[PDB]
Design an enzyme around this catalytic site. Sequence first.
Site, mmCIF file in Angstrom:
data_model
loop_
_atom_site.group_PDB
_atom_site.id
_atom_site.type_symbol
_atom_site.label_atom_id
_atom_site.label_comp_id
_atom_site.label_asym_id
_atom_site.label_seq_id
_atom_site.Cartn_x
_atom_site.Cartn_y
_atom_site.Cartn_z
ATOM 1 N N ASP A 43 3.642 -2.603 -7.153
ATOM 2 C CA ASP A 43 2.267 -3.005 -6.897
ATOM 3 C C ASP A 43 1.589 -2.063 -5.906
ATOM 4 O O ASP A 43 1.882 -2.100 -4.712
ATOM 5 C CB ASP A 43 2.238 -4.451 -6.382
ATOM 6 C CG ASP A 43 0.839 -4.929 -6.048
ATOM 7 O OD1 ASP A 43 -0.126 -4.337 -6.559
ATOM 8 O OD2 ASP A 43 0.711 -5.908 -5.285
ATOM 9 N N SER B 54 -15.367 5.481 -8.402
ATOM 10 C CA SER B 54 -15.624 5.980 -9.742
ATOM 11 C C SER B 54 -17.076 6.412 -9.852
ATOM 12 O O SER B 54 -17.956 5.851 -9.195
ATOM 13 C CB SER B 54 -15.297 4.913 -10.793
ATOM 14 O OG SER B 54 -15.769 5.289 -12.083
HETATM 15 O O1 LIG Z 1 -2.604 -8.987 -4.478
HETATM 16 C C1 LIG Z 1 -3.491 -8.090 -5.145
HETATM 17 C C2 LIG Z 1 -2.871 -6.717 -4.966
HETATM 18 N N1 LIG Z 1 -2.087 -6.410 -6.217
HETATM 19 C C3 LIG Z 1 -2.286 -7.526 -7.204
HETATM 20 C C4 LIG Z 1 -0.995 -8.257 -7.461
HETATM 21 N N2 LIG Z 1 -0.822 -9.480 -7.793
HETATM 22 C C5 LIG Z 1 0.492 -9.501 -8.226
HETATM 23 C C6 LIG Z 1 1.139 -10.688 -8.796
HETATM 24 C C7 LIG Z 1 2.416 -10.620 -9.336
HETATM 25 C C8 LIG Z 1 2.997 -11.730 -9.917
HETATM 26 C C9 LIG Z 1 2.334 -12.952 -9.931
HETATM 27 C C10 LIG Z 1 2.945 -14.144 -10.581
HETATM 28 F F1 LIG Z 1 4.122 -13.889 -11.129
HETATM 29 F F2 LIG Z 1 2.191 -14.626 -11.543
HETATM 30 F F3 LIG Z 1 3.125 -15.146 -9.740
HETATM 31 C C11 LIG Z 1 1.081 -13.031 -9.347
HETATM 32 C C12 LIG Z 1 0.482 -11.916 -8.793
HETATM 33 N N3 LIG Z 1 1.121 -8.361 -8.096
HETATM 34 O O2 LIG Z 1 0.123 -7.500 -7.563
HETATM 35 C C13 LIG Z 1 -3.430 -8.359 -6.638
#
Ligand SMILES: O[C@H]1CN[C@@H](c2nc(-c3ccc(C(F)(F)F)cc3)no2)C1
Length: 330
Positions: free
Chosen positions: A35, A199
């Site tokens: 991420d 952008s």
């Molecule tokens: O936080 C911001 C920065 N990067 C984004 C982010 N969000 C998630 C995420 C992963 C897995 C889940 C779940 F599995 F559904 F629970 C939810 C969100 N991973 O990166 C948004």
Amino acid sequence: STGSATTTPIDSLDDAYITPVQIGTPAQTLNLDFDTGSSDLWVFSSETTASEVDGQTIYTPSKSTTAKLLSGATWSISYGDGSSSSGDVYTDTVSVGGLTVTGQAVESAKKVSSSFTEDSTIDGLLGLAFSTLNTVSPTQQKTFFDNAKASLDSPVFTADLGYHAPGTYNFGFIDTTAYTGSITYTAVSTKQGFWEWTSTGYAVGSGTFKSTSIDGIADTGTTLLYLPATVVSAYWAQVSGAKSSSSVGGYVFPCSATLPSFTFGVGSARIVIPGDYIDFGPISTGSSSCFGGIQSSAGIGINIFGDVALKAAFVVFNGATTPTLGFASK
Ligand SMILES: O[C@H]1CN[C@@H](c2nc(-c3ccc(C(F)(F)F)cc3)no2)C1
């Protein structure tokens, strides 16, 4: 040094991407969500509340001869969608695609929210934003990239996400065979701890390009492309029957539609997102109404170039003294 690891969509819609990561000695391989929008490396573990674990692979620090409890350290994080997790902290050896970091902070979950429990394919997250966002208290910890940076051949990593297909995260080098044309680099603000850039505008389908500054973050951890309401309205206006549904929570469209492409600007360069990248399928099983992959950022506070945008490009995350972002078509 360098590293190279394959990243794989977790499902048929590319809702997220997982990448195998070796933790501890002997290695425990967990599939983590890389991420670029956060800066914690956390994992499902032997410490996670049992009722909150449902199919995930867990890290067991007691079985790692190189694991050391980081005394007094805790972590707690909330993501853009409201999901969350928290726990304590170990340091251990972490390897990604042949690149090894010793003494990496590995955040062990004691609690995870329901959306994590319900996603059996994600064993945790590996944050690749700037370390200023790391939530470990009382002593903030560095990301995997931050720890590896000085040892890398070049202080960079690249994201090459696939459309309904595997792709690649590389560390320390740029694979010049992985893209077409040139890489266009653009300035990054690190003031908010994100890979934030601007952008230069957009086009819808074969329409004329609109020059307009769109500030946003390059976020591999977000599924969709979130853009200003004006831009998003302009896009879905070109899809017969498309509309914003409050009950569904965004733009939906007839599954029989043919979606136009969406182009975004990187300096004078252009990245074209094919229309089918914007299709996220039936809103519910068996429905003929489909969910759009471009949505309004109005309720967010920032624009987000998530996977829908990033998978259309080869993306260089340049962590030099003055960080920049590079985009190439592929
Ligand atoms: O936080 C911001 C920065 N990067 C984004 C982010 N969000 C998630 C995420 C992963 C897995 C889940 C779940 F599995 F559904 F629970 C939810 C969100 N991973 O990166 C948004």
